[PDB]
């Protein structure tokens, strides 16, 4: 939920009340009675909690940030799942033994360099959540360095389909591709369904890019296509404008018609939101509020 | 921390003090007394004690 780990290190090892040992500029801010909200609040403390603050502010203490700088590292390693969460009580029990064994002027200044690049040079972790080359760009640029670029029929639409497929894994942060076994896959979401067999799809689409099929043929592709190729073309449909594969290829009978099939449900869901909200507006059997509703929409 | 600086006295108010009576006189069944409770000068009295 947080952005930075060192703020949680500054939340688990700093005093919540204002002390002059660490925040002098706020502890002296209220001794001299110069504060906007509640100014006159330090005279009326007795000699117990005046001298226990007014001595320690005009000459500060000299504490040791060794126990605090390591929590800005041990947290920064468990935020990125390098360590198990069940385990950080051991490594801080081992790093604090480490940097007190080999302590110097250098290591106290070398940890302090390392609690800055886990703050402002950990912006790469903010970066490839957006560009998602975790598993979407550099894991697919091996796939595009695997397919043959010499297709006999349809030389131009072959390199515009994968030009529209690299855009698919780029405009979606959740989708990713990977190497499992001798073939590459592609899931549209983490914790997600609809895994396409990406090797067994472009091998099915090879020798298929030029057909120029007529518009009176529907039930032939049970022995020609494969339903995951029929689902990969479903996942390429919203990111494919009308200028990719124009009109008369058999993919124009597929990719354009898949956008119309998505174009049905992206307005009939708004119809389905109306019907399920008027069954309780007039009084309708909720068991029979979905049987006849779906049959009108399928 | 049990506060100081104008919570308690600095100045020897007597903690409790015996009043003396004056003008007492009798009847065969009854009995009068009189006192001058002279709470005075920067002190209070609570009258339950």
């Amino acid at each position: 939920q947080q952005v930075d780990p060192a703020m949680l290190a500054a939340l688990q090892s700093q005093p919540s009340g204002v002390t002059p040992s660490d925040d002098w500029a706020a502890a002296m801010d209220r001794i001299l009675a110069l504060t906007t909200r509640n100014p006159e609040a330090f005279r009326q403390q007795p000699q117990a909690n005046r001298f226990s603050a007014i001595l320690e502010a005009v000459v500060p203490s000299r504490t040791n940030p060794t126990h605090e700088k390591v929590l800005a590292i041990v947290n920064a390693l468990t935020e990125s799942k390098a360590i198990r969460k069940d385990e950080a009580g051991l490594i801080y029990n081992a790093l604090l033994e480490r940097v007190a064994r080999y302590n110097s002027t250098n290591v106290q200044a070398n940890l302090d360099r390392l609690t800055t690049d886990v703050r402002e040079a950990v912006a790469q972790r903010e970066r490839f959540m957006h560009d998602t080359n975790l598993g979407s760009q550099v894991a697919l640029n091996a796939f595009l360095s695997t397919l043959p670029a010499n297709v006999p029929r349809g030389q131009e639409d072959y390199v515009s389909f994968i030009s529209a497929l690299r855009l698919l894994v780029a405009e979606v942060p959740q989708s990713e591709v990977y190497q499992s076994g001798p073939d590459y896959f592609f899931q549209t979401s983490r914790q997600g369904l609809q895994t396409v067999n990406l090797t067994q799809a472009f091998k099915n689409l090879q020798g298929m890019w030029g057909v120029r099929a007529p518009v009176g043929d529907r039930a032939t592709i049970s022995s020609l296509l494969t339903p995951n190729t029929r689902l990969l073309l479903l996942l390429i449909a919203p990111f494919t404008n009308s200028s990719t594969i124009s009109r008369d290829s058999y993919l124009g009978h597929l990719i354009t018609l898949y956008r119309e099939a998505i174009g049905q449900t992206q307005v009939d869901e708004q119809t389905f939101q109306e019907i399920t909200s008027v069954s309780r507006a007039l009084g309708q059997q909720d068991t029979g509020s979905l049987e006849a509703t779906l049959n009108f929409l399928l | 921390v049990a506060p100081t600086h104008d919570v308690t006295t600095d100045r020897s108010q007597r903690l409790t003090l015996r009043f003396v009576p004056v003008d007492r006189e009798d009847t065969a069944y009854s009995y009068k007394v009189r006192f001058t409770l002279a709470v005075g000068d920067n002190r209070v009295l609570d009258m339950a004690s």
């Binding site: 009340g17 509640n38 403390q45 909690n49 | 049990a2 506060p3 600086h5 104008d6 919570v7």
Partner: peptide, 29 residues
């Protein structure tokens, strides 16, 4: 504020509840 009169638990003075200013002790009240 009158903070220099309350016996402070720490830095915060011990300021009581709001029923500690009056009383309503009648026979059946």
């Amino acid at each position: 504020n009158f903070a220099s009169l309350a016996p402070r638990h720490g830095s915060r003075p011990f300021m009581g509840t709001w029923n500690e200013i009056g009383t309503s002790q009648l026979n059946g009240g």
